[PDB]
Design a protein around this ligand. Structure first.
Ligand SMILES: *[C@@H]1O[C@H](CO[C@@H]2O[C@@H](C)[C@@H](O)[C@@H](O)[C@@H]2O)[C@@H](O[C@@H]2O[C@H](CO)[C@@H](O[C@@H]3O[C@H](CO[C@H]4O[C@H](CO)[C@@H](O)[C@H](O)[C@@H]4O)[C@@H](O)[C@H](O[C@H]4O[C@H](CO)[C@@H](O)[C@H](O)[C@@H]4O)[C@@H]3O)[C@H](O)[C@H]2NC(C)=O)[C@H](O[C@H]2O[C@@H](C)[C@@H](O)[C@@H](O)[C@@H]2O)[C@H]1NC(C)=O
Ligand SMILES: *[C@@H]1O[C@H](CO[C@@H]2O[C@@H](C)[C@@H](O)[C@@H](O)[C@@H]2O)[C@@H](O[C@@H]2O[C@H](CO)[C@@H](O[C@@H]3O[C@H](CO[C@H]4O[C@H](CO)[C@@H](O)[C@H](O)[C@@H]4O)[C@@H](O)[C@H](O[C@H]4O[C@H](CO)[C@@H](O)[C@H](O)[C@@H]4O)[C@@H]3O)[C@H](O)[C@H]2NC(C)=O)[C@H](O[C@H]2O[C@@H](C)[C@@H](O)[C@@H](O)[C@@H]2O)[C@H]1NC(C)=O
Ligand SMILES: *[C@@H]1O[C@H](CO[C@@H]2O[C@@H](C)[C@@H](O)[C@@H](O)[C@@H]2O)[C@@H](O[C@@H]2O[C@H](CO)[C@@H](O[C@@H]3O[C@H](CO[C@H]4O[C@H](CO)[C@@H](O)[C@H](O)[C@@H]4O)[C@@H](O)[C@H](O[C@H]4O[C@H](CO)[C@@H](O)[C@H](O)[C@@H]4O)[C@@H]3O)[C@H](O)[C@H]2NC(C)=O)[C@H](O[C@H]2O[C@@H](C)[C@@H](O)[C@@H](O)[C@@H]2O)[C@H]1NC(C)=O
Ligand SMILES: *[C@@H]1O[C@H](CO[C@H]2O[C@@H](C)[C@@H](O)[C@@H](O)[C@@H]2O)[C@@H](O[C@@H]2O[C@H](CO)[C@@H](O[C@@H]3O[C@H](CO[C@@H]4O[C@H](CO)[C@@H](O)[C@H](O)[C@@H]4O)[C@@H](O)[C@H](O)[C@@H]3O)[C@H](O)[C@H]2NC(C)=O)[C@H](O)[C@H]1NC(C)=O
Ligand SMILES: *[C@@H]1O[C@H](CO[C@@H]2O[C@@H](C)[C@@H](O)[C@@H](O)[C@@H]2O)[C@@H](O[C@@H]2O[C@H](CO)[C@@H](O)[C@H](O)[C@H]2NC(C)=O)[C@H](O[C@H]2O[C@@H](C)[C@@H](O)[C@@H](O)[C@@H]2O)[C@H]1NC(C)=O
Ligand SMILES: *[C@@H]1O[C@H](CO[C@H]2O[C@@H](C)[C@@H](O)[C@@H](O)[C@@H]2O)[C@@H](O[C@@H]2O[C@H](CO)[C@@H](O)[C@H](O)[C@H]2NC(C)=O)[C@H](O[C@H]2O[C@@H](C)[C@@H](O)[C@@H](O)[C@@H]2O)[C@H]1NC(C)=O
Ligand SMILES: *[C@@H]1O[C@H](CO)[C@@H](O[C@@H]2O[C@H](CO)[C@@H](O)[C@H](O)[C@H]2NC(C)=O)[C@H](O[C@H]2O[C@@H](C)[C@@H](O)[C@@H](O)[C@@H]2O)[C@H]1NC(C)=O
Ligand SMILES: *[C@@H]1O[C@H](CO)[C@@H](O[C@@H]2O[C@H](CO)[C@@H](O)[C@H](O)[C@H]2NC(C)=O)[C@H](O)[C@H]1NC(C)=O
Ligand SMILES: *[C@@H]1O[C@H](CO)[C@@H](O[C@@H]2O[C@H](CO)[C@@H](O)[C@H](O)[C@H]2NC(C)=O)[C@H](O)[C@H]1NC(C)=O
Ligand SMILES: *[C@@H]1O[C@H](CO)[C@@H](O[C@@H]2O[C@H](CO)[C@@H](O)[C@H](O)[C@H]2NC(C)=O)[C@H](O)[C@H]1NC(C)=O
Ligand SMILES: *[C@@H]1O[C@H](CO)[C@@H](O[C@@H]2O[C@H](CO)[C@@H](O)[C@H](O)[C@H]2NC(C)=O)[C@H](O)[C@H]1NC(C)=O
Ligand SMILES: *[C@@H]1O[C@H](CO)[C@@H](O)[C@H](O)[C@H]1NC(C)=O
Lengths: 170, 322, 170, 170, 322, 322
């Protein structure tokens, strides 16, 4: 009933981003399948790079020196403490930065859908400010599909929308 | 009529941390930290490890009678040894350069025992000598299978030459007897002489007679110290000895690998499993980039870190409207 | 008199982001307290993460070898050179990247306040292009407060606004 | 004839971002020189930082040990494997991340030009949804230059625009 | 009627660098690089260092008479030594494996001197011998407090055994006399023999008689070379000597810690201050993640970097409306 | 009338990878990875390397008659040695501590050979001895130019003292003869003694006579083992020898540098070129941050990585409207 401004939708079950419509023929949730897939491929690519770029040298446990070489064993230990601190700090900050960016990426994708719809409708709708548009003309299932597919024609519905705008203006 | 733009919510309880916010609920996430302890010892990339059972590596190599002999040509990805092996070096002495030897034989593609010296060639001397500190069964007296303790030299010079006509390097191990006193020296060798020079390729190793008492260990105030060398394809080795010497009657032909693994110290048995990365407290059979299980590992491994968790957000902020 | 497009306000003394209103009753600066507090928490969290994640192994100064072991001392010295070059490069770029993002973060928060006001007013105001809105009806302190609190009623003022817009379209 | 929404322009040859216009006098491409220069300085600063921050200790090849110290030579070898894996991973992820951001940066800069035109024209134009604006009044070369320079006067063409809009509304 | 959206400017002169721009003015910012020099030597985490005053570590451990004696049990977080100690090894000779010893004693939870050997138990021999190279003051011949120089063996074999019955390891330090010539060997020992074996746990150390001239150093062409070992809890040590031996009459029970610190080399005094991280040029009492003060440090420290500054923007671009 | 906002496209075939997408066409890009193999050996920051031609470093240092004598005072930024030098240590024996020595002489600001000992000072002795194992441009017997083999000592003690009064440290190299048997020992020295002590500063090095046969190597069952040491400014060295000594007649004065480089192993010759970074398979004359050419390098170098490519996007997504 309300849009992305107020939160997420339990009812959107076939994708990441999408639409909810209401008209005389009924209502429903529908995923923007293409925006979802594109975001899925991007996130999968990100996760797979973080994983697959770790292509390592063969790891050895041969780290022993003779009993009169404790100083060398200590060097081996502080080498490993050195790398432990590098990898720990870097891994920790990578996760925190990437999580911030991943959440923003989702916000940018949702905003893009909103902007795409906003610009098709123009003043044939009133932006309700909650992620929803109040459409100023009868918008049936074919009309809804056209908005979703990006093929909505402003001028087709301009006259009817303008008359509806008049009584609001009173 | 209305159309709304929105996004997916679900019943996930997963949360993630970001640089700006803590404990943010998300619809899905993915861990990049392997954290699982399973305690299994496996094969490494389909290659089995050498299981020393209750023996130490030096005991297995020299052939402590209580250790299983190597009968067939074999290979292994790494070596599994008990934390405190029951069967170690039985005649007290030091095994020289054990750390460097591990680098050579911790991962091998071919490994085979062979007789190298016919001990019957030397005369006026006794051979295959034995000791109650190295028994097979209780109250017995035996000795390392691979090594041949020669006695009663009486100061006589024994000379031996060998060429490696195989295409793999040859590992040999020998011993040098430090006697407790002149009387023992006489009892064992019949002369106050007994020094040995062994030559491998162009390296010369000389062991002059040393007579000196030590503390009693496993019944012995005397010592036999062990040394090893590698003879390369077409390389020669030679021995000159007037006594006090334990001969490398047997040796091992072997083929090196490029990847050095090491010894996994564990009480556990090898299980019927396979892993790309192994530690002494379990397999890390994962390609995730990080792990917090153990500092030391072998194989194709994630990097060790001390993070408790490293969870990437994949999904959306899980903030459904009422 | 002008807004964010043209620069910051020395007169905004009690917050990071906010408003300046002008009506018949008076004029003045006021912070958006909630947008400010939210941003402060985010930046505090960022800084505290960058500092607190440096959780290190105990550091030792035992790096000595015997006089016939200079090759080992040299190994120990190049180990420290190695970590020095790692930490120095990574610390520099981290600061450079995090500063770029912190500044973008502030821009995004200001733009958000802007968008929120804009979608509330709709055509009840003219966007002057400098971060300010010329509103087409008398807007008293309660009205100004409502705009700031997000409870402005577009339909309450539609009629008065339309009349003034007509006088403008001439 | 279409804009950034649908892709780039081979015809824009003197800058990174810019405009294409169409009026009675004719048509043509023109770079936004200022926005281009600002972005160029930004990207040059980025690449130079990534390169110049690599200020290193003097590198040596003295890494040998005697024939009875193979365990020390092994420690030396794994120290280099260690640094090898640290630099490889971090260099790879640095490039992947910076490339994602450089592309977003270009997108942001194009969006800025678009927002700046949109807010000047307001309802004197119809947003065609493809990166272009259909202007509701005659807009000669001077007028076009004013839009590109940010000095376009809304109220000067309002009456003419309102007349053309009412015709569309029929 | 008008409403505007805007943001905060102030009079700040701070600037930051970003990946894209240099020297950008901001309303506030925060450094994450510790830069401050204070030159103080402090307690580390509430725990005081061992002040060696003007002695070297070996001189203090062995009890050079010019160094202060450890009268009561103590502990310390690190060792503070002058760069060039006035009082070092007085009887010339080498101190074996000092680097390995530092790893053991640089950070201790307990350290207590105790008499290990009753030197009256030996007969036909002189003890507590003394030398002009180790004075307590000018012309006052003396010797290390902890090490007992035994002479006039005449080839007689002395025997000693000790059992560590504490829960703390025991550090012992001894010396072996290399005489210059047969005549010197005679006046000190009365025989052309003088060899020692010292056994600690399973380990045997043998020091045969060495008679050989060296260059004169502080009046001496002979040498006393020093060695040390650790007797673990429930372990024993024993000594068999026929001469040329400086006995470990006193030793130190000590409790190891996990965190190895080391020796801080400096002429400064220890001040009344506490820090989480110490360097030889001053304390880095900071939780900032980086420092550019010194490559070597001890404790809970920021990482050393070459940067001149590392400043994070926290506030806004400070670009007030003209 | 219309106005549109747009951006640049071109016919670049360049692609980059990002965290979200692979092979994205862009209008421009810039590699930060140096990849080019040129196979040149160069000067390093304007400083020439030392070219050993076909001598090994010890053979050159000692002055094997078959390599070129250093005549002038010289300097070098690194050392260039053949992988398999034709001319090495001609008289069989070990060269002590080569690796530590390399750290001292790999990069020098000044390097100059001088005569240190006047060998004509010794009577009843033969000097400048010669051997068929160390021949000239063939054949005829000779010896290392810097090292003077003294014979026919007949148990007589020789004594030498030297003071370094120069302001640079001095490198000296000496040898000690291990004879095969008593008959050989008598043939060379005329007596069954031959022991040497060389003191440098406060360090004493003692080489007692060793008679022991080895394998025949270049016509020799005996050996000469080589040692070296550094005499600091205002320090002395001395030698006491009764035989079996090869004297350090010549030495090198040198000036140490702060930047340790090492030995470049290659068969290539030095080219008239100049680089800031050198590897043994070519120069890396670049300020790029990373390189994938070789693990081992010298100078001011990019970091070694395993990547095949590191390409930063600079331009825009190259997706022109159809
Ligand atoms: C650290 O040293 C401890 C003492 O060392 C001994 O004295 C030194 C000065 C030196 O001479 C060294 O060579 C000596 O061995 C040592 O503890 C000793 O261990 C001995 C066994 O190795 C043990 O010998 C036994 O002595 C018994 C004598 O009677 C006991 O009770 C008497 C009551 O007054 C009194 O005299 C003492 O309390 C005596 O201990 C014998 O009864 C016994 O005979 C058995 O063994 C014979 C041969 O093996 C058999 O033929 C016979 O049939 C019996 O079975 C045996 O000789 C010493 O008593 C013992 N000394 C003390 C004071 O405890 C530590 O070694 C052992 O530690 C003991 C406690 C055990 O755990 C044992 O297994 C350890 O090996 C030693 N610690 C280490 C780590 O080596
Ligand atoms: C971005 O690439 C554009 C495409 O280039 C084409 O693909 C490249 C990968 C490469 O293989 C190139 O050879 C291809 O041409 C490029 O645009 C091209 O520019 C060419 C240079 O003038 C031009 O060549 C002409 O082609 C004529 C062929 O006729 C056209 O129509 C034919 C229908 O069947 C078909 O063949 C193609 O569609 C052809 O375009 C030739 O007749 C003409 O010959 C004259 O000039 C020759 C040398 O200049 C003389 O030797 C000869 O005697 C004649 O006088 C000439 O070969 C391509 O037509 C043109 N392609 C298209 C589709 O426009 C861009 O470079 C240039 O773009 C043109 C339009 C100009 O603006 C020019 O200033 C640009 O440099 C290139 N973008 C940039 C900025 O470089
Ligand atoms: C590097 O070696 C230097 C030379 O070593 C000496 O000769 C070698 C060949 C070898 O035999 C070696 O064993 C010799 O010691 C050495 O410099 C020497 O240091 C000696 C003291 O350690 C010193 O002895 C003094 O000799 C004086 C007489 O000689 C002077 O006059 C002579 C005739 O005109 C002339 O031939 C000499 O060159 C001198 O100019 C004695 O007067 C003096 O006795 C007095 O002082 C003693 C203590 O100071 C008292 O005990 C005594 O009662 C008298 O009052 C003393 O015996 C040598 O002269 C000196 N040789 C030279 C040529 O200088 C370096 O060590 C010392 O350097 C000297 C200058 C001091 O600074 C000292 O502190 C240094 O240790 C030596 N360098 C090092 C670092 O070891
Ligand atoms: C000895 O030095 C160590 C440093 O590491 C060393 O550990 C030794 C055992 C040894 O192996 C050595 O080689 C190795 O380098 C010190 O241990 C660190 O110091 C303290 C412990 O008091 C810890 O710092 C604080 O940790 C607090 C709590 O931990 C946090 O838990 C919560 C979980 O909700 C979470 O916020 C984080 O995960 C934290 O881990 C924090 O409140 C506080 O702010 C500090 O950060 C630190 O974690 C310890 N590290 C390790 C590896 O143990 C010892 O204190 C030194 N020993 C002595 C007696 O001084
Ligand atoms: C031996 O281990 C290497 C590890 O890489 C390095 O190369 C070695 C030759 C040696 O120099 C080591 O010290 C180095 O660390 C490993 O090679 C890697 O294997 C992984 C397996 O997942 C590959 O993904 C990766 O590409 C590869 N990396 C490198 C740098 O080569 C070897 O495994 C591979 O060996 C090659 C010869 C093939 O048999 C291949 O199928 C196998 O994965 C490993 N060698 C063996 C025989 O196991
Ligand atoms: C020796 O190598 C220098 C690299 O850094 C070294 O510093 C030494 C003191 C020593 O600790 C080495 O272990 C360590 O690796 C190098 O100096 C570097 O030059 C950079 C050029 O941009 C400067 O940033 C900086 O001075 C220095 N880098 C660092 C991190 O210290 C020397 O080469 C250059 O030295 C500087 C001072 C220049 O002015 C020139 O004299 C010279 O090109 C190098 N010395 C020599 C003689 O090659
Ligand atoms: C381009 O269009 C503009 C907008 O109408 C014209 O400029 C305006 O002219 C009116 C009077 O005609 C004047 O009141 C405005 O101040 C002026 N606005 C702008 C944006 O400058 C312009 O026509 C006029 O140009 C001016 C400079 C003058 O020469 C006048 O005589 C002329 O009619 C248009 N330019 C052309 C060549 O058509
Ligand atoms: C849904 O409504 C749309 C919009 O009116 C209808 O599309 C038009 O239908 C009218 C009358 O049938 C025609 O005059 C137009 O030619 C149609 N225009 C388009 C967009 O094709 C559509 O027919 C309606 N669909 C249903 C199922 O009633
Ligand atoms: C290894 O030993 C063999 C002997 O079994 C050596 O072969 C002889 O070499 C000498 C000179 O090198 C020749 O004169 C003989 O003709 C060879 N005899 C045989 C039967 O081959 C061989 O040279 C030795 N290897 C080395 C490196 O000395
Ligand atoms: C502020 O402006 C509004 C709009 O003209 C007026 O407040 C209205 O007053 C009456 C009863 O209070 C009702 O028409 C509305 O419920 C009120 N609107 C609001 C904003 O609640 C009034 O002119 C002004 N209010 C004050 C404080 O004078
Ligand atoms: C290494 O790079 C430097 C810097 O580009 C080169 O030095 C230049 O060499 C050219 C000759 O081709 C001369 O103009 C100057 O000596 C340098 N250029 C300037 C203007 O500074 C050097 O030639 C490169 N080394 C090699 C052989 O690749
Ligand atoms: C170190 O930090 C603590 C806690 O802030 C403080 O009490 C103490 O004064 C500091 N020590 C120094 C060196 O000032």
């Amino acid at each position: 009933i309300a849009g992305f401004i107020e939160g997420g939708w339990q009812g959107l079950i076939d994708g990441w981003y999408g639409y909810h419509h209401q008209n005389s023929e009924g209502s429903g949730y529908a995923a923007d399948k293409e925006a979802t897939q594109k975001a899925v491929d991007a996130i999968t690519t990100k996760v797979n790079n973080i994983i697959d770029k770790m292509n390592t040298q063969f790891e050895s446990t041969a780290k022993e020196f003779n009993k009169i070489e404790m100083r060398i064993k200590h060097l081996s230990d502080r080498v490993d403490d050195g790398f432990l601190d590098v990898w720990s700090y870097n891994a920790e900050l990578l996760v925190l930065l990437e999580n911030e960016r991943t959440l923003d990426f989702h916000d940018a994708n949702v905003n893009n859908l909103y902007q795409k719809v906003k610009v098709q409708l123009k003043d044939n709708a009133i932006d309700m400010g909650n992620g929803c548009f109040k459409i100023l003309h009868k918008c049936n299932n074919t009309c809804m599909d056209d908005i979703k597919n990006g093929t909505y024609n402003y001028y087709e519905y301009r006259k009817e929308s303008h008359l509806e705008k008049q009584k609001i203006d009173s | 009529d209305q159309i709304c733009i929105g996004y997916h919510s679900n019943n996930s309880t997963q949360t993630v941390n970001t640089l700006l916010e803590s404990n943010v609920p998300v619809t899905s996430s993915h861990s990049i930290l392997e954290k699982e302890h399973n305690g299994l010892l496996c094969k490494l990339k389909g290659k089995a490890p050498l299981d020393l059972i209750d023996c130490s590596l030096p005991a297995w190599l020299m052939g402590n009678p209580k250790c299983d002999e190597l009968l067939t040509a074999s290979e292994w990805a790494y070596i599994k040894e008990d934390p405190e092996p029951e069967n170690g070096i039985c005649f007290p002495g030091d095994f020289d350069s054990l750390e460097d030897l591990i680098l050579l034989v911790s991962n091998t593609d071919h490994f085979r025992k062979e007789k190298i010296i016919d001990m019957t060639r030397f005369s006026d001397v006794t051979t295959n000598n034995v000791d109650s500190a190295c028994p097979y069964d209780t109250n017995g007296a035996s000795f390392y299978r691979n090594l041949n303790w020669v006695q009663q030299n009486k100061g006589k010079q024994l000379i031996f030459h060998y060429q490696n006509s195989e295409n793999n390097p040859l590992l040999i191990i020998w011993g040098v007897h430090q006697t407790s006193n002149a009387a023992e020296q006489n009892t064992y060798y019949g002369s106050q002489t007994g020094s040995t020079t062994i030559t491998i390729g162009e390296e010369t190793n000389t062991y002059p007679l040393v007579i000196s008492e030590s503390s009693i260990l496993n019944g012995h105030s005397d010592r036999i110290n062990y040394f090893w060398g590698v003879v390369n394809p077409n390389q020669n080795f030679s021995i000159v000895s007037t006594g006090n010497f334990i001969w490398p009657e047997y040796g091992y032909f072997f083929q090196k690998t490029t990847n050095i693994s090491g010894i996994i110290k564990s009480s556990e048995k090898i299980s019927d499993c396979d892993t790309i990365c192994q530690t002494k407290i379990g397999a890390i059979n994962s390609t995730l980039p990080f792990q917090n299980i153990h500092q030391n590992a072998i194989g194709d491994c994630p990097k060790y870190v001390k993070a408790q968790e490293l969870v990437l957000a994949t999904g959306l902020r899980n903030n459904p409207i009422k």
